[model samples]
Target: SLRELKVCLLGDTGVGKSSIVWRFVEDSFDPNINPTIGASFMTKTVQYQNELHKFLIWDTAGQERFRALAPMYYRGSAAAIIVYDITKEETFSTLKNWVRELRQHGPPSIVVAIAGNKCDLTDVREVMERDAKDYADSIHAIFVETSAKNAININELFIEISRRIP
Candidate 1:
């Protein structure tokens, strides 16, 4: 049986949310990517644990102006990935707000993931993996550092979430 999962991505602007989605769903990156308005939709098929899963993803806008609309997109989602730019401490701080909102208003059993994007920019990184992982552990969320530009850990992110799905 093929399981269909509804997923959403949330983060601050310029945190590479769209890039990560593009890399995972389309396997490509756009340097001149445009910011998402409300959100963008995409899907990908993944095989995990000898089962097939279809990920219906909503790449929500990271702009502050659209922040209020995030819950509308993630309300029915099975999983949510709150992303942050590893090179920007402010983005990591913003990620916490996203988590708080989801926990308060989103699905009670939603699978949560924390993605520290821009891992390839390690030299400029402001968020450490350990810090992010520790926070994830506190909330029982899956955590990963991904570089959409380098295609690192993009697929693994989804596969890890797939393994966690009931």
Candidate 2:
């Protein structure tokens, strides 16, 4: 039996957190999905470096009203997918604050990945790849760019995180 790892998706609204999970788990796209009200759970089995790993993913809501409950969601997380919309500059700006909060409430050994989403919309990117990579490096997080709609680099992102997580 593969060890089950708890993963949480944290990001601003419209950052494609749910889409990423859907893409990885179902290998399909649903563009008109509604914004996550609270949180949603899904599971997937992944193979990384020849080891089978099972992930229990929690996709969290980003509304300000839900901020108070974030800590509860992160309590037992082994890894977190911190997403940002590449076309939305403010979403990148707010990542540090999210990181800070996660640091305060997350498990000390929790691994984090800073994911810059909507890579398919490269022409409208508001946050440069180099900058996002630098910020993720500063926080000791793995960095990746993905597009759930296009199914581009979606699985690769999760695979990288799985490889990084213990």
Candidate 3:
């Protein structure tokens, strides 16, 4: 069967929110590109568990100036990928606020996943995997570390989302 799902991306500035989205749908990356102003729109389709899914993605900007505009994008989303850079401490800590906002404003049925991005840069990591995982567990969100530049677990992320969708 064919199903359409609305997916949302949220994270702090420079945490690679758009990178994750671009890596998934475009299958490419351009780091020099500017940050997302409000929200970037993109689409991708994948086959998971014998079903085809068409994802209508809304990747929201991460800057504080755009924080107030985030809820508008994820209001009725079927899933959300909340990302944080593993190489940064603040980004990891700030995820809670993003999750809180989502819990308060997003649809009850939205499947939320917490991602630790830039896992490729393991040498400079400021966020521990266990800590993020524990937080994700505590918040009842799926946890995964991704390396968008290296294509690490990026495709599998969406596959997991596809499998989790109702």
Candidate 4:
């Protein structure tokens, strides 16, 4: 039997949410990928400890104009992968705000994962790993640093989420 999990990706513009999905679902990367308009959907199945988990992912648009409709996608999501670019301090702040809003209005008991993306860009890294990890821990959320461009921890992110789902 396959268990379906609805998941949504939320974060600031150009934070690599789409890239994360591409890497996880298609095992591919496109540096020229277009910015998500409104939102996009994708799915992938994982075998985890004798269970087949199918993740229905909504990659929500991070543009300010699309923010208003984001809730429509997450209202029923069982998990949220909130991504932020490590090279952009502002993006991390935006991620925190998304987490705040989701907790207040999203489904109760939703699993939250904080992803510090663009980890490969160490040269311009502006967000501290300690700060993101501390914040995720304070809220009891799963945390990881990933580089979608390099395919780091992308599969582990979803597998970790599957393990946490009740």
Top-scoring candidate (lDDT): 4
Q: Which 10 consecutive positions of candidate 1 have the poorest summed lDDT?
A: 91-100
lDDT tens digits by residue: candidate 4, 42-92: 999889888899999999998889989988988888899999999989988
Model 1: per-residue Cα lDDT over 51-161, one tens digit each:
889999999998889988987988889899999999999888777788889988999999999999999998898998999899899989999999999999999899889
Model 2 residue runs over 4 Å out of place are none
CA error at residue 125 for candidate 1, angstroms: 0.9
Give the Å shift of residue 42 in candidate 1: 0.5
Clashes of each: 0, 0, 0, 0
- Model 3, 11-75: lDDT tens digits are 88899989989999998988797888988999998887687899999988988899888878888
Candidate 1 lDDT for residue 91 = 87
Q: How high is each candidate's TM-score?
A: 0.96, 0.95, 0.96, 0.97
**All candidates: CA RMSD (Å):** 1.0, 1.1, 1.1, 0.8
* lDDT value for model 2: 0.88
Give candidate 1 regions above 4 Å deviation.
none
Q: List per-prediction Cα lDDT, in the order shown.
A: 0.90, 0.88, 0.89, 0.92
For residues 43-128, write the lDDT of model 2, one tens digit per residue. Answer: 99876666778889898988777777788788888898899999999999999988998887788999999899999998898999
TM-score of 3: 0.96
Q: What is the lDDT of residue 148 in candidate 3?
A: 83
